[PDB]
């Protein structure tokens, strides 16, 4: 009973020290787990959502909401641990262009989620506000037959959840472009809206 | 005395506390009930103006005193997720805040650390008030040690 | 900042010792200050705007808006209007409204719980003559009801039923409690013989010191 | 040694997987493989049943192609059918401790064959665990529908020879 | 040769590593959505996490036996040693140890010093008596152990996240008398 939605309390500074209850180190210890356990939890996720949903579209939106609830957490944790706690630090750039948060994703997010850095990151020549984020080998979903793409939305559900909470609202879809020796390649394309673009249209 | 707040993106507060020096056992005479929520919502406009610009009036997470208004120095801070850490400075006379940027910037840094510790709970979703007494105990010890 | 300076205009107009008549700049000022916050987020500021708007619309003496913004302050009923202190002024801004044009249907339809229509015979010589449904005989039904506001003097008067049969009642002019669920006493249906065919009823008609209003249907379901 | 037709049966029913691949011909597959898989399921129990009036360790030959295992290992069918040997083919069978069996019909004709067979069928058990059991669309005890498991095993067999 | 030695050898061959923090975040999003959509009725979500864990473990045992070939555990103390020393050591990076046997050696408690399934988690206050957080392993510890026909039943007593001193799970088996004919 400290902060309700009803009032504000007034208590004096430089009073007595209160009790010590719960604390934890924010910086990561290096922890590893098998790929099989997270793959088993991932297929159990897709199995339960296959069980309790009717058609493909709202299944995809529910999986994207599942990814969203990791991404909105993950933004502040990765930026705070890339700024460096009780140790003396400061504050990163807190980047605000479009072309460097995607650089931040392709550099740090994919090398945080996985051992390897993300592969390629190109724009679209035919239209602006379309950005291609591509890998060669999806390590979330390498265990499903390749003709289904909807099970690939969870990771781009992260990316929308990484982007909308960072101040750039957008929308993502994913397709599979079988280019080269990689049969599954998994393009994720990011559709922004107009209302952000003219904002950076206003900023020269 | 200082009024401290953390405000959401859809203009709602998740944390609010007011802490005073013990000489004035009652703090902020008559401003506390009416003036201090309204001038904070007024300062949210200009913090929303300066969040998207590049070169201020470096590093964009901290920023100085954003306005001065009825002799009150209003100091802001912008987190990575868009949360805004506006905290005002009152006194009977005028107040100097820029000399405490050696200390108050660090105060905003570990209360940002405390907010990241709050956010990592999977049960705690955003647009929820931070209804935890442990958070109060840490932020008033940080208010004591960063006076 | 426009919100703050319109608040400053309205509080500076509040504190004058003079008197001022009605003028439609006040009308457009009230609609732009209510529409300025996205009311129809933060809730304390919405309370602190319309708690001044009700005082200015009292000082102008246009009772339609103090009735309207009292029936907008009903949205913030269950928190941040404290235990009959601010609800005291929420009463004394609504009693001259309810003795005037404010005849709206008592702020919410969430009053009536699931009433039970049993009857209690006393003879084993008569039991269910025939050739879920109730098979009502010679007895009387029962209702129970609540309100949730911190105010007192919710006053039901003349509770009776719908366009159903000659089921009637007698008198109900008594009170009901503030927070609790006061079970209203025996309504005493004086039923008439009709045809066997069944048809359920939604609710029954209750006035709150007014004319008898519409349904105020049962919670969570129709509860037939 | 050389493997030419693959069969994966259920632990308690008719078979889930069958491929007569690398025989460039058409042989019948419709509905007699269910009957023969059920008779293998019966006669494993019959062959275990009789007792004459009376080890079990395999070896690593680096079969395949980082292999799947780098040590000698153990076996889960002490008293059960292990191969069948005829004029035209030898059938190598290997069951797993949960009750699931794997059948490799091998057209090579006439000890060490048991070692390389148990090593190969443990490797295809590893690819079955790593590529079918992880799949969410695959329900339990249903026919194999994965297209990926196909070129995971075709490449293994064409890496063997 | 010994299981407590060769589990580390399997921990450095054909176990592709992934960060445990991602595993915690996806499990936390699962239990957060399960909390939200069941209208805060916290006794049902332990059953639903058990129903997820049964389908985890009944497919996990055929990967565990494939990655490491073992004979059948001839006594249930060897079951406790493989669950202490290779089962939770290959998949997760944790080495729990066994204590608190029943005197007839039917029941064993798996004391678990730290859980890498819940790092950042703090429970809400209304759920503080009726939600065991890391329920999912219990379904696994039914499922896998039900497929080697050790017909057991798995349940919690206490955990650190509920304010108690320690996390331990007590498992006892009922009957077996069933196995492959070979």
JSON list of N, CA and C in Angstrom, two decimals, chain D residues 101-160:
[
{"chain": "D", "resi": 101, "resn": "UNK", "atom": "N", "xyz": [10.44, -49.51, -32.79]},
{"chain": "D", "resi": 101, "resn": "UNK", "atom": "CA", "xyz": [11.38, -50.29, -33.58]},
{"chain": "D", "resi": 101, "resn": "UNK", "atom": "C", "xyz": [11.58, -49.68, -34.96]},
{"chain": "D", "resi": 102, "resn": "UNK", "atom": "N", "xyz": [12.76, -49.95, -35.53]},
{"chain": "D", "resi": 102, "resn": "UNK", "atom": "CA", "xyz": [13.22, -49.40, -36.79]},
{"chain": "D", "resi": 102, "resn": "UNK", "atom": "C", "xyz": [13.76, -50.53, -37.65]},
{"chain": "D", "resi": 103, "resn": "UNK", "atom": "N", "xyz": [13.34, -50.58, -38.92]},
{"chain": "D", "resi": 103, "resn": "UNK", "atom": "CA", "xyz": [13.61, -51.70, -39.81]},
{"chain": "D", "resi": 103, "resn": "UNK", "atom": "C", "xyz": [14.32, -51.19, -41.06]},
{"chain": "D", "resi": 104, "resn": "UNK", "atom": "N", "xyz": [15.45, -51.81, -41.40]},
{"chain": "D", "resi": 104, "resn": "UNK", "atom": "CA", "xyz": [16.21, -51.48, -42.60]},
{"chain": "D", "resi": 104, "resn": "UNK", "atom": "C", "xyz": [16.39, -52.74, -43.43]},
{"chain": "D", "resi": 105, "resn": "UNK", "atom": "N", "xyz": [15.66, -52.84, -44.53]},
{"chain": "D", "resi": 105, "resn": "UNK", "atom": "CA", "xyz": [15.77, -53.96, -45.46]},
{"chain": "D", "resi": 105, "resn": "UNK", "atom": "C", "xyz": [16.95, -53.68, -46.38]},
{"chain": "D", "resi": 106, "resn": "UNK", "atom": "N", "xyz": [17.92, -54.58, -46.41]},
{"chain": "D", "resi": 106, "resn": "UNK", "atom": "CA", "xyz": [19.20, -54.36, -47.06]},
{"chain": "D", "resi": 106, "resn": "UNK", "atom": "C", "xyz": [19.41, -55.44, -48.11]},
{"chain": "D", "resi": 107, "resn": "UNK", "atom": "N", "xyz": [19.60, -55.03, -49.36]},
{"chain": "D", "resi": 107, "resn": "UNK", "atom": "CA", "xyz": [19.70, -55.99, -50.45]},
{"chain": "D", "resi": 107, "resn": "UNK", "atom": "C", "xyz": [21.07, -56.65, -50.56]},
{"chain": "D", "resi": 108, "resn": "UNK", "atom": "N", "xyz": [22.04, -56.25, -49.74]},
{"chain": "D", "resi": 108, "resn": "UNK", "atom": "CA", "xyz": [23.33, -56.93, -49.69]},
{"chain": "D", "resi": 108, "resn": "UNK", "atom": "C", "xyz": [23.17, -58.35, -49.13]},
{"chain": "D", "resi": 109, "resn": "UNK", "atom": "N", "xyz": [23.94, -59.28, -49.69]},
{"chain": "D", "resi": 109, "resn": "UNK", "atom": "CA", "xyz": [23.74, -60.71, -49.49]},
{"chain": "D", "resi": 109, "resn": "UNK", "atom": "C", "xyz": [24.93, -61.28, -48.74]},
{"chain": "D", "resi": 110, "resn": "UNK", "atom": "N", "xyz": [24.64, -61.99, -47.64]},
{"chain": "D", "resi": 110, "resn": "UNK", "atom": "CA", "xyz": [25.54, -62.91, -46.92]},
{"chain": "D", "resi": 110, "resn": "UNK", "atom": "C", "xyz": [26.79, -62.24, -46.31]},
{"chain": "D", "resi": 111, "resn": "UNK", "atom": "N", "xyz": [28.40, -60.36, -38.25]},
{"chain": "D", "resi": 111, "resn": "UNK", "atom": "CA", "xyz": [28.91, -59.89, -36.97]},
{"chain": "D", "resi": 111, "resn": "UNK", "atom": "C", "xyz": [29.17, -58.39, -37.03]},
{"chain": "D", "resi": 112, "resn": "UNK", "atom": "N", "xyz": [30.06, -57.98, -37.94]},
{"chain": "D", "resi": 112, "resn": "UNK", "atom": "CA", "xyz": [30.36, -56.56, -38.12]},
{"chain": "D", "resi": 112, "resn": "UNK", "atom": "C", "xyz": [29.19, -55.83, -38.77]},
{"chain": "D", "resi": 113, "resn": "UNK", "atom": "N", "xyz": [28.40, -56.56, -39.57]},
{"chain": "D", "resi": 113, "resn": "UNK", "atom": "CA", "xyz": [27.19, -56.01, -40.17]},
{"chain": "D", "resi": 113, "resn": "UNK", "atom": "C", "xyz": [26.17, -55.60, -39.12]},
{"chain": "D", "resi": 114, "resn": "UNK", "atom": "N", "xyz": [26.10, -56.36, -38.02]},
{"chain": "D", "resi": 114, "resn": "UNK", "atom": "CA", "xyz": [25.26, -56.01, -36.87]},
{"chain": "D", "resi": 114, "resn": "UNK", "atom": "C", "xyz": [25.75, -54.73, -36.20]},
{"chain": "D", "resi": 115, "resn": "UNK", "atom": "N", "xyz": [27.07, -54.54, -36.14]},
{"chain": "D", "resi": 115, "resn": "UNK", "atom": "CA", "xyz": [27.65, -53.34, -35.53]},
{"chain": "D", "resi": 115, "resn": "UNK", "atom": "C", "xyz": [27.35, -52.08, -36.34]},
{"chain": "D", "resi": 116, "resn": "UNK", "atom": "N", "xyz": [27.57, -52.15, -37.66]},
{"chain": "D", "resi": 116, "resn": "UNK", "atom": "CA", "xyz": [27.33, -50.97, -38.50]},
{"chain": "D", "resi": 116, "resn": "UNK", "atom": "C", "xyz": [25.82, -50.73, -38.66]},
{"chain": "D", "resi": 117, "resn": "UNK", "atom": "N", "xyz": [25.02, -51.80, -38.57]},
{"chain": "D", "resi": 117, "resn": "UNK", "atom": "CA", "xyz": [23.57, -51.67, -38.63]},
{"chain": "D", "resi": 117, "resn": "UNK", "atom": "C", "xyz": [23.01, -51.01, -37.37]},
{"chain": "D", "resi": 118, "resn": "UNK", "atom": "N", "xyz": [23.49, -51.42, -36.19]},
{"chain": "D", "resi": 118, "resn": "UNK", "atom": "CA", "xyz": [23.01, -50.82, -34.95]},
{"chain": "D", "resi": 118, "resn": "UNK", "atom": "C", "xyz": [23.47, -49.38, -34.81]},
{"chain": "D", "resi": 119, "resn": "UNK", "atom": "N", "xyz": [24.66, -49.07, -35.35]},
{"chain": "D", "resi": 119, "resn": "UNK", "atom": "CA", "xyz": [25.15, -47.69, -35.36]},
{"chain": "D", "resi": 119, "resn": "UNK", "atom": "C", "xyz": [24.31, -46.81, -36.28]},
{"chain": "D", "resi": 120, "resn": "UNK", "atom": "N", "xyz": [23.99, -47.32, -37.48]},
{"chain": "D", "resi": 120, "resn": "UNK", "atom": "CA", "xyz": [23.19, -46.56, -38.44]},
{"chain": "D", "resi": 120, "resn": "UNK", "atom": "C", "xyz": [21.75, -46.37, -37.97]},
{"chain": "D", "resi": 121, "resn": "UNK", "atom": "N", "xyz": [21.17, -47.39, -37.35]},
{"chain": "D", "resi": 121, "resn": "UNK", "atom": "CA", "xyz": [19.79, -47.26, -36.92]},
{"chain": "D", "resi": 121, "resn": "UNK", "atom": "C", "xyz": [19.67, -46.45, -35.63]},
{"chain": "D", "resi": 122, "resn": "UNK", "atom": "N", "xyz": [20.74, -46.39, -34.82]},
{"chain": "D", "resi": 122, "resn": "UNK", "atom": "CA", "xyz": [20.75, -45.43, -33.71]},
{"chain": "D", "resi": 122, "resn": "UNK", "atom": "C", "xyz": [20.86, -44.00, -34.23]},
{"chain": "D", "resi": 123, "resn": "UNK", "atom": "N", "xyz": [21.61, -43.79, -35.32]},
{"chain": "D", "resi": 123, "resn": "UNK", "atom": "CA", "xyz": [21.68, -42.46, -35.92]},
{"chain": "D", "resi": 123, "resn": "UNK", "atom": "C", "xyz": [20.35, -42.03, -36.55]},
{"chain": "D", "resi": 124, "resn": "UNK", "atom": "N", "xyz": [19.59, -42.98, -37.12]},
{"chain": "D", "resi": 124, "resn": "UNK", "atom": "CA", "xyz": [18.30, -42.57, -37.67]},
{"chain": "D", "resi": 124, "resn": "UNK", "atom": "C", "xyz": [17.27, -42.43, -36.55]},
{"chain": "D", "resi": 125, "resn": "UNK", "atom": "N", "xyz": [17.49, -43.08, -35.40]},
{"chain": "D", "resi": 125, "resn": "UNK", "atom": "CA", "xyz": [16.69, -42.79, -34.21]},
{"chain": "D", "resi": 125, "resn": "UNK", "atom": "C", "xyz": [16.96, -41.38, -33.69]},
{"chain": "D", "resi": 126, "resn": "UNK", "atom": "N", "xyz": [18.22, -40.95, -33.78]},
{"chain": "D", "resi": 126, "resn": "UNK", "atom": "CA", "xyz": [18.60, -39.60, -33.39]},
{"chain": "D", "resi": 126, "resn": "UNK", "atom": "C", "xyz": [17.95, -38.56, -34.29]},
{"chain": "D", "resi": 127, "resn": "UNK", "atom": "N", "xyz": [17.93, -38.81, -35.60]},
{"chain": "D", "resi": 127, "resn": "UNK", "atom": "CA", "xyz": [17.27, -37.87, -36.51]},
{"chain": "D", "resi": 127, "resn": "UNK", "atom": "C", "xyz": [15.75, -37.92, -36.39]},
{"chain": "D", "resi": 128, "resn": "UNK", "atom": "N", "xyz": [15.19, -39.06, -35.98]},
{"chain": "D", "resi": 128, "resn": "UNK", "atom": "CA", "xyz": [13.76, -39.13, -35.72]},
{"chain": "D", "resi": 128, "resn": "UNK", "atom": "C", "xyz": [13.39, -38.31, -34.50]},
{"chain": "D", "resi": 129, "resn": "UNK", "atom": "N", "xyz": [14.21, -38.39, -33.45]},
{"chain": "D", "resi": 129, "resn": "UNK", "atom": "CA", "xyz": [13.96, -37.59, -32.25]},
{"chain": "D", "resi": 129, "resn": "UNK", "atom": "C", "xyz": [14.17, -36.11, -32.51]},
{"chain": "D", "resi": 130, "resn": "UNK", "atom": "N", "xyz": [15.15, -35.77, -33.34]},
{"chain": "D", "resi": 130, "resn": "UNK", "atom": "CA", "xyz": [15.53, -34.38, -33.53]},
{"chain": "D", "resi": 130, "resn": "UNK", "atom": "C", "xyz": [14.65, -33.72, -34.59]},
{"chain": "D", "resi": 131, "resn": "UNK", "atom": "N", "xyz": [13.94, -34.49, -35.43]},
{"chain": "D", "resi": 131, "resn": "UNK", "atom": "CA", "xyz": [13.19, -33.86, -36.52]},
{"chain": "D", "resi": 131, "resn": "UNK", "atom": "C", "xyz": [11.73, -34.25, -36.64]},
{"chain": "D", "resi": 132, "resn": "UNK", "atom": "N", "xyz": [11.20, -35.14, -35.80]},
{"chain": "D", "resi": 132, "resn": "UNK", "atom": "CA", "xyz": [9.79, -35.49, -35.88]},
{"chain": "D", "resi": 132, "resn": "UNK", "atom": "C", "xyz": [9.13, -35.15, -34.56]},
{"chain": "D", "resi": 133, "resn": "UNK", "atom": "N", "xyz": [9.81, -35.50, -33.46]},
{"chain": "D", "resi": 133, "resn": "UNK", "atom": "CA", "xyz": [9.23, -35.31, -32.13]},
{"chain": "D", "resi": 133, "resn": "UNK", "atom": "C", "xyz": [9.21, -33.83, -31.75]},
{"chain": "D", "resi": 134, "resn": "UNK", "atom": "N", "xyz": [10.09, -33.04, -32.36]},
{"chain": "D", "resi": 134, "resn": "UNK", "atom": "CA", "xyz": [10.08, -31.60, -32.18]},
{"chain": "D", "resi": 134, "resn": "UNK", "atom": "C", "xyz": [8.96, -30.92, -32.96]},
{"chain": "D", "resi": 135, "resn": "UNK", "atom": "N", "xyz": [8.36, -31.60, -33.92]},
{"chain": "D", "resi": 135, "resn": "UNK", "atom": "CA", "xyz": [7.37, -30.95, -34.78]},
{"chain": "D", "resi": 135, "resn": "UNK", "atom": "C", "xyz": [6.03, -30.81, -34.06]},
{"chain": "D", "resi": 136, "resn": "UNK", "atom": "N", "xyz": [5.43, -29.62, -34.05]},
{"chain": "D", "resi": 136, "resn": "UNK", "atom": "CA", "xyz": [4.14, -29.47, -33.36]},
{"chain": "D", "resi": 136, "resn": "UNK", "atom": "C", "xyz": [2.96, -30.00, -34.15]},
{"chain": "D", "resi": 137, "resn": "UNK", "atom": "N", "xyz": [3.07, -30.05, -35.48]},
{"chain": "D", "resi": 137, "resn": "UNK", "atom": "CA", "xyz": [1.95, -30.53, -36.29]},
{"chain": "D", "resi": 137, "resn": "UNK", "atom": "C", "xyz": [1.83, -32.05, -36.21]},
{"chain": "D", "resi": 138, "resn": "UNK", "atom": "N", "xyz": [2.93, -32.74, -35.94]},
{"chain": "D", "resi": 138, "resn": "UNK", "atom": "CA", "xyz": [2.92, -34.19, -35.83]},
{"chain": "D", "resi": 138, "resn": "UNK", "atom": "C", "xyz": [2.24, -34.62, -34.54]},
{"chain": "D", "resi": 139, "resn": "UNK", "atom": "N", "xyz": [1.07, -35.25, -34.66]},
{"chain": "D", "resi": 139, "resn": "UNK", "atom": "CA", "xyz": [0.39, -35.81, -33.51]},
{"chain": "D", "resi": 139, "resn": "UNK", "atom": "C", "xyz": [1.06, -37.14, -33.14]},
{"chain": "D", "resi": 140, "resn": "UNK", "atom": "N", "xyz": [0.67, -37.71, -32.01]},
{"chain": "D", "resi": 140, "resn": "UNK", "atom": "CA", "xyz": [1.31, -38.92, -31.50]},
{"chain": "D", "resi": 140, "resn": "UNK", "atom": "C", "xyz": [0.77, -40.14, -32.23]},
{"chain": "D", "resi": 141, "resn": "UNK", "atom": "N", "xyz": [1.69, -41.01, -32.66]},
{"chain": "D", "resi": 141, "resn": "UNK", "atom": "CA", "xyz": [1.43, -42.32, -33.28]},
{"chain": "D", "resi": 141, "resn": "UNK", "atom": "C", "xyz": [0.63, -42.19, -34.57]},
{"chain": "D", "resi": 142, "resn": "UNK", "atom": "N", "xyz": [1.05, -41.27, -35.43]},
{"chain": "D", "resi": 142, "resn": "UNK", "atom": "CA", "xyz": [0.52, -40.96, -36.74]},
{"chain": "D", "resi": 142, "resn": "UNK", "atom": "C", "xyz": [1.59, -41.15, -37.80]},
{"chain": "D", "resi": 143, "resn": "UNK", "atom": "N", "xyz": [1.21, -41.35, -39.08]},
{"chain": "D", "resi": 143, "resn": "UNK", "atom": "CA", "xyz": [2.21, -41.41, -40.16]},
{"chain": "D", "resi": 143, "resn": "UNK", "atom": "C", "xyz": [3.03, -40.14, -40.32]},
{"chain": "D", "resi": 144, "resn": "UNK", "atom": "N", "xyz": [4.30, -40.34, -40.69]},
{"chain": "D", "resi": 144, "resn": "UNK", "atom": "CA", "xyz": [5.25, -39.24, -40.81]},
{"chain": "D", "resi": 144, "resn": "UNK", "atom": "C", "xyz": [4.91, -38.41, -42.03]},
{"chain": "D", "resi": 145, "resn": "UNK", "atom": "N", "xyz": [4.77, -37.10, -41.84]},
{"chain": "D", "resi": 145, "resn": "UNK", "atom": "CA", "xyz": [4.39, -36.20, -42.91]},
{"chain": "D", "resi": 145, "resn": "UNK", "atom": "C", "xyz": [5.47, -35.17, -43.20]},
{"chain": "D", "resi": 146, "resn": "UNK", "atom": "N", "xyz": [6.56, -35.17, -42.43]},
{"chain": "D", "resi": 146, "resn": "UNK", "atom": "CA", "xyz": [7.64, -34.19, -42.58]},
{"chain": "D", "resi": 146, "resn": "UNK", "atom": "C", "xyz": [8.41, -34.38, -43.87]},
{"chain": "D", "resi": 147, "resn": "UNK", "atom": "N", "xyz": [8.50, -33.31, -44.65]},
{"chain": "D", "resi": 147, "resn": "UNK", "atom": "CA", "xyz": [9.31, -33.35, -45.86]},
{"chain": "D", "resi": 147, "resn": "UNK", "atom": "C", "xyz": [10.79, -33.23, -45.53]},
{"chain": "D", "resi": 148, "resn": "UNK", "atom": "N", "xyz": [11.11, -32.65, -44.37]},
{"chain": "D", "resi": 148, "resn": "UNK", "atom": "CA", "xyz": [12.50, -32.41, -44.01]},
{"chain": "D", "resi": 148, "resn": "UNK", "atom": "C", "xyz": [13.20, -33.70, -43.59]},
{"chain": "D", "resi": 149, "resn": "UNK", "atom": "N", "xyz": [12.45, -34.61, -42.96]},
{"chain": "D", "resi": 149, "resn": "UNK", "atom": "CA", "xyz": [12.98, -35.89, -42.49]},
{"chain": "D", "resi": 149, "resn": "UNK", "atom": "C", "xyz": [13.43, -36.77, -43.66]},
{"chain": "D", "resi": 150, "resn": "UNK", "atom": "N", "xyz": [12.73, -36.65, -44.80]},
{"chain": "D", "resi": 150, "resn": "UNK", "atom": "CA", "xyz": [13.07, -37.28, -46.07]},
{"chain": "D", "resi": 150, "resn": "UNK", "atom": "C", "xyz": [14.48, -36.95, -46.52]},
{"chain": "D", "resi": 151, "resn": "UNK", "atom": "N", "xyz": [14.80, -35.68, -46.81]},
{"chain": "D", "resi": 151, "resn": "UNK", "atom": "CA", "xyz": [16.18, -35.39, -47.22]},
{"chain": "D", "resi": 151, "resn": "UNK", "atom": "C", "xyz": [17.16, -35.35, -46.06]},
{"chain": "D", "resi": 152, "resn": "UNK", "atom": "N", "xyz": [16.71, -35.50, -44.81]},
{"chain": "D", "resi": 152, "resn": "UNK", "atom": "CA", "xyz": [17.67, -35.84, -43.77]},
{"chain": "D", "resi": 152, "resn": "UNK", "atom": "C", "xyz": [18.09, -37.30, -43.82]},
{"chain": "D", "resi": 153, "resn": "UNK", "atom": "N", "xyz": [17.23, -38.21, -44.29]},
{"chain": "D", "resi": 153, "resn": "UNK", "atom": "CA", "xyz": [17.66, -39.61, -44.31]},
{"chain": "D", "resi": 153, "resn": "UNK", "atom": "C", "xyz": [18.18, -40.05, -45.68]},
{"chain": "D", "resi": 154, "resn": "UNK", "atom": "N", "xyz": [17.77, -39.37, -46.77]},
{"chain": "D", "resi": 154, "resn": "UNK", "atom": "CA", "xyz": [18.23, -39.75, -48.11]},
{"chain": "D", "resi": 154, "resn": "UNK", "atom": "C", "xyz": [19.72, -39.44, -48.22]},
{"chain": "D", "resi": 155, "resn": "UNK", "atom": "N", "xyz": [20.12, -38.31, -47.65]},
{"chain": "D", "resi": 155, "resn": "UNK", "atom": "CA", "xyz": [21.51, -37.88, -47.63]},
{"chain": "D", "resi": 155, "resn": "UNK", "atom": "C", "xyz": [22.35, -38.77, -46.73]},
{"chain": "D", "resi": 156, "resn": "UNK", "atom": "N", "xyz": [21.76, -39.33, -45.66]},
{"chain": "D", "resi": 156, "resn": "UNK", "atom": "CA", "xyz": [22.49, -40.25, -44.80]},
{"chain": "D", "resi": 156, "resn": "UNK", "atom": "C", "xyz": [22.77, -41.57, -45.52]},
{"chain": "D", "resi": 157, "resn": "UNK", "atom": "N", "xyz": [21.77, -42.07, -46.25]},
{"chain": "D", "resi": 157, "resn": "UNK", "atom": "CA", "xyz": [21.93, -43.34, -46.97]},
{"chain": "D", "resi": 157, "resn": "UNK", "atom": "C", "xyz": [22.88, -43.17, -48.15]},
{"chain": "D", "resi": 158, "resn": "UNK", "atom": "N", "xyz": [22.77, -42.05, -48.87]},
{"chain": "D", "resi": 158, "resn": "UNK", "atom": "CA", "xyz": [23.71, -41.78, -49.95]},
{"chain": "D", "resi": 158, "resn": "UNK", "atom": "C", "xyz": [25.06, -41.27, -49.45]},
{"chain": "D", "resi": 159, "resn": "UNK", "atom": "N", "xyz": [25.19, -40.97, -48.16]},
{"chain": "D", "resi": 159, "resn": "UNK", "atom": "CA", "xyz": [26.50, -40.79, -47.55]},
{"chain": "D", "resi": 159, "resn": "UNK", "atom": "C", "xyz": [27.11, -42.12, -47.14]},
{"chain": "D", "resi": 160, "resn": "UNK", "atom": "N", "xyz": [26.26, -43.13, -46.88]},
{"chain": "D", "resi": 160, "resn": "UNK", "atom": "CA", "xyz": [26.78, -44.45, -46.54]},
{"chain": "D", "resi": 160, "resn": "UNK", "atom": "C", "xyz": [27.44, -45.12, -47.73]}
]
